[PDB]
Design a binder for this molecule. Sequence first.
Ligand SMILES: *Cc1c(COP(=O)(O)O)cnc(C)c1O
Ligand SMILES: *Cc1c(COP(=O)(O)O)cnc(C)c1O
Lengths: 791, 802
Amino acid sequence: QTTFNKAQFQAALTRQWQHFGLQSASEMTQRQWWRAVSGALAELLAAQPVAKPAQGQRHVNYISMEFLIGRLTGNNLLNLGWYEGVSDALKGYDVNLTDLLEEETDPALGNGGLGRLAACFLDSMATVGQSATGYGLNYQYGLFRQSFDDGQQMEAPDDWGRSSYPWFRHNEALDVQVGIGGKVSKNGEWQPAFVITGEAWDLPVLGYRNNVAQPLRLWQAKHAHPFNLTKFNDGDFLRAEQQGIDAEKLTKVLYPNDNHQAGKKLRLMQQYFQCACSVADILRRHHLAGRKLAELADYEVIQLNDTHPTIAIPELLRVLIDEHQLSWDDAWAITSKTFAYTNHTLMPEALECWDEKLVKALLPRHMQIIKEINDRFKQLVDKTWPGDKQVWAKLAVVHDKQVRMANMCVVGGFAVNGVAALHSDLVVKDLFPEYNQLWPNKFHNVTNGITPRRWIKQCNPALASLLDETLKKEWANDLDQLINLEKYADDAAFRQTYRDIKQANKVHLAEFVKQRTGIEINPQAIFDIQIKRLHEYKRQHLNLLHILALYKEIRENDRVPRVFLFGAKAAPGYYLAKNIIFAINKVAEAINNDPKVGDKLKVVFLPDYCVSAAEKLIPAADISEQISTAGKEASGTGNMKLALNGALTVGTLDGANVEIAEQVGEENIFIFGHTVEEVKALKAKGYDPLKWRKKDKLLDAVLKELENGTYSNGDKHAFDQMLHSLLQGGDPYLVLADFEAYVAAQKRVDELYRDEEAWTRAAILNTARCGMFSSDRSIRDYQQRIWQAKR
Amino acid sequence: HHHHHHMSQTTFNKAQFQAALTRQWQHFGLQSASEMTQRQWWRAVSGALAELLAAQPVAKPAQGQRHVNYISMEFLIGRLTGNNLLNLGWYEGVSDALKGYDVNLTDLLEEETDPALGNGGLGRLAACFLDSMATVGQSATGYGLNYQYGLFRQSFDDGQQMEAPDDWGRSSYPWFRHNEALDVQVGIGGKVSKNGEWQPAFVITGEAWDLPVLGYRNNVAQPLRLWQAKHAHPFNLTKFNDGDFLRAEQQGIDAEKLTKVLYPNDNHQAGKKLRLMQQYFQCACSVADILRRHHLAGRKLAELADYEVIQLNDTHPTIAIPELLRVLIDEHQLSWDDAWAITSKTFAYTNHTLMPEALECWDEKLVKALLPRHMQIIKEINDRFKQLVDKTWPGDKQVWAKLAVVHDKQVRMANMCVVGGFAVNGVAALHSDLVVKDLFPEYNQLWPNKFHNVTNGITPRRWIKQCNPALASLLDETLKKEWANDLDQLINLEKYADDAAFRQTYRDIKQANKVHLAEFVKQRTGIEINPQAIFDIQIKRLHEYKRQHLNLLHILALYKEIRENPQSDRVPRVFLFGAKAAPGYYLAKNIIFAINKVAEAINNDPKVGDKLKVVFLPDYCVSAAEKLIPAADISEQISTAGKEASGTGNMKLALNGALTVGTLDGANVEIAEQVGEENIFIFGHTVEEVKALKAKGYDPLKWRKKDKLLDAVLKELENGTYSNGDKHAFDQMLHSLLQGGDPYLVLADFEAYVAAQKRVDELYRDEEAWTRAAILNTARCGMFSSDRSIRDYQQRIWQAKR
Ligand SMILES: *Cc1c(COP(=O)(O)O)cnc(C)c1O
Ligand SMILES: *Cc1c(COP(=O)(O)O)cnc(C)c1O
């Protein structure tokens, strides 16, 4: 690892403020300082020699519609080992590095766990030495920036300075032309009606202390003729920009509303644009390496993260057949050995499908290709289930004027994997059982993971230092070493040091909470954290009901003091989720100001949850809330972050809680509530939440407080949408049915927290036993089972 | 006169250049310099030079001299990379270094689209002036707009002018620097409260995008600060999620439209409103930036005029005057008298206009709606000026109607400039006299020290040393003293007109320039032009009064003469045009159509062959001018007498050795005086003769019936000869010449023009007498250096006592 060169950094920093047009470094604003330091570091990085790839290893092309990368400058310094050198150089300018890093708005490039998984996997590939390129979209405004207006969620664009972001590099020789719409001539020539330019905007992915730097390649859409001077000179200044906007709209927003025809068409264009550019770029790299097209699968593999990039399959077929004149069988022999598909889905109804009419109109050549895939696949299905029209309707790639993208992924690729042992079994038994009959060796598991660089070393540096002194071998790229901590759970000095670190993290969070909300929270209390997206089945309103129960007990009658912290976004137009957010904020207003409670209870809903906020919340967690309805979580990478940093999990037996309980032991986790099978049986027998209300005085009471205006200044319909989902709507995620199990589990939490030694033992054991959650281990599993396997 | 400019050439450093180049292709994400495309090579070389420039020591401003803020709505700067290398003295060093990469520097420079930041001579004057201020050590900032698409990019489709956006990679242009600390907030519309607080309806951010203006071998680098408009909240997520993707961008597009296009069509109300917003945005940003510099230098607001002067190039930035009053009054609580005491000693105004009817005016209804607080300030200017007019012409209502700043619901911007400033100047001796006599005689009575002349000029760096390096090195070898920042040295060339070896070298250079233009013409049009022919060049904007169609009728006459007599003794000719017609200018576009159709016929007629070709080079620009001007034998300067104040193109062509065929008006007057009547071809009706002819009732139909040659060439345009039978092809041009009354006297000057062009043949036949005349045009035109212009501005206005 090349060491920090202070004189080179100084010369690079000087070039930055000279380029701004300033006379000295001291003239910079705090924003300019962050841009200049980041740009200087980018210059030094770009001068570093490129560590060459491992011979005889396939290069991985990882395609994802989100990359939730978080801030990059601090992460890059940690991976290079330059943090201390830069920190000290900046003290010479009276600049505080840690404060400067807070100038960076998180690049708004992803939404949730799907995009954070892609980011952790890029980081791990760079660290374990898997040559790879990430392929995404360079979104200008992300999903949205969340704020609270009288407790209601408000949505604005999440701008992040995309065009001026200092870590970008743009090689214009990688621009790609993408066609849209039009017709296919009688002789098979696609004549698009609209053409878009894709520019590659590259961010660096740095490996840990190994001089590896690989690209996250983010495509940005533009038009070659965006502006119509005739319309401008006629006075129509807005419509003059129309052609440009029709291209640039592809990379404005992540997951824009698709409940209408314009938005459905937009989503499909985004996916195709991403895949046409990516496919062109992969073939260009292969060609410039002097490699033959027929051997593409020997040198390259393409990982499809969910079904969003499915269209890459017929796009690659299109290029091979139409632009390189390969036979169908020769083209398919390549694509069918190049594409692998990662499934994140639990129910068949959630698999992605497109109206054939929209695909035909938008991508007429691809629709012909897709129908030929479909027609050729029918021969095999009829061989195996002769005359069975029902099996064909299920397995078809096109049927009833519908294109089944997940089906096309299974039929068109050599591997399918789920993201946890139980999920990957369900992929085979529930989603694709017939396909598994045809192609048993196609299906695999790779359990998800998280990078220990960002999520321990960077956000929890004091815990990281403890691990450095205690463990014999390096652990930051060898997380299985954490198991050697088990012994120190019995050492009273270790315990005291470890618990002190957790308390110092809770104090640090207290500051951050007081800056954003002004609320003062009690660091002696239990920090009880739920950081899931806001969806009904995540049951933030189950959390709410328990909080109301705690609030009620304090108002009347020795519970441990608590601080409930929430971070969650709701999709725009998801009115029920937004009403749950409204209730939580309204109830927190009462609790935080009510003098009857004081320092016994506070609720903090931090707005605009993002990677940067998670780095501050997660090291401070005592309790990790993982209370989704059993059956509805395949994984849970947040769960893994929280456990490794020494929070204890309260949760249902599903998703990543299964893995955590398996590793840490029943003494060290709080599993509760209906199992997957018990949820199904309760609905099968007839579940009425109203009957459960009638027999539960505490439950009826907290729900009365939400119906009678106690938290809305006398509006009885403030929380109307939440309450109807729980009562006449039928409570389909079983908030009431799990209520008393949850309340009872949380009482066990109190008891452990009073036994300070036993609590700390449990926390240490969560850190020590969860080394398997490293995304380095995930990547090695992908390498052995899929990417580097023999075809 | 002996000028002593402090020379300071930091020498080229090949190692530093190599390291900067390496950072550029590393920043592109490449593995070696050799991977670069041609376009990347230009970006990398230009960006490396920008890094080295930014690392040079910054020249400090001259002690005790006012700083000049030069505000213009256009800056026609041309390509920067080659000019910057020449001013730095690094051209040969970079050329040699690039040979080590097998890169040819002169080829690489051609990758650059001219920054589309100006239109014609008004903007090129502003660019020559900025270059000269840097070279003479006048501390200065130019203030303009960072137009994304310029005026338009010109092409020809079946001979007709087509107009497209003139995109030039604005946001990625490698010489730009942007200091976000200079961003300015600009308000639009709204209302003024009863307490006098302006509450705007729309707010726009102005970003300063700076280009460097480099002096000649003196390490001076000064900013051309170009404002670009943006909105702080350009994008509406609710509308995007509703599927209204274009309307989602409305707020941003409504701000950005201010710096999209230069001189957008204002034939309609939306365009008029846009132009006024463009002008206000430029002036609000510039005024804020000037005050910021003054305040950061620790200087007192009351002393602004002792340290700063603001030059208004034409009336487009007039609104800067009430804008500075607004800031002084509303934001610094100055009384009107104390504010006016500052502004009236800070602003100076350069007039380019000839007719009172052409002076810029705005509807009061529109100024009130867009700038309600400024309208109040402007009325106060008006009301206070009336008290002065009352004292001098009491109760005279016609005088007041003439001099008022606001009258009959119109705001007179030129009047506001005179009333509100301390100096007014015209751009040539005779023009500046007419400004006082015809335009502003009453103002000159009130303020007899306010009016001046400063004759225009051009920079010798771009317009001789860069575009004509062979002539430059002849001047170097011959004069043995530096002439590029001391152009009056050219007068020492006079005697070399009698040195046959010099004449031969000077002639070899003209001919080599013609060969180089022939290559470029072949590359751009496919036409092979004859380098032994007279290269006859007209490079004016396309306007009826520039009379490109007088040139056309003469071409037709020459074509007829040598078609009907293959034994004709006329000298071979190549007629070259560069000209854009403003969008929507239908007559000018029909003149273009006629020229291109006649050229098509001539160029493909084997009867004439290499005796005659006509080349209309599309998309005339600075870079095209640098190829055409050094190759010119004849400089066409044939506007109707009375319609030209100046003619900077005229000066460039004369210095590079072309002889002028022109009317006695504009810059031709001063050229003819300097070079002598024997060395120029003045023709046609005088200014006075034009006026008298029209008053006697001029009827072009009568002239046509008495002139059989004129009748014959016009018939060729009427009967489908050049039109594949379409007799209506040139209806608009023919009508303007005939039933329309020929207002610019094309027919009246035709035979005088034909006769002058025959004298051109006769001189060109004796290459000694021709070369002698050309040498003496180069030798005697040193006064047309923009360095001399700047010295005059300094002595008379910028550094004068108030
Ligand atoms: C890790 C992470 C996630 C995923 O966490 P889950 O509990 O699986 O939803 C989402 N957002 C951010 C910012 C994260 O860091
Ligand atoms: C010098 C110049 C002008 C001004 O020339 P005129 O003959 O006065 O119109 C206009 N355009 C360009 C490109 C020039 O170089």
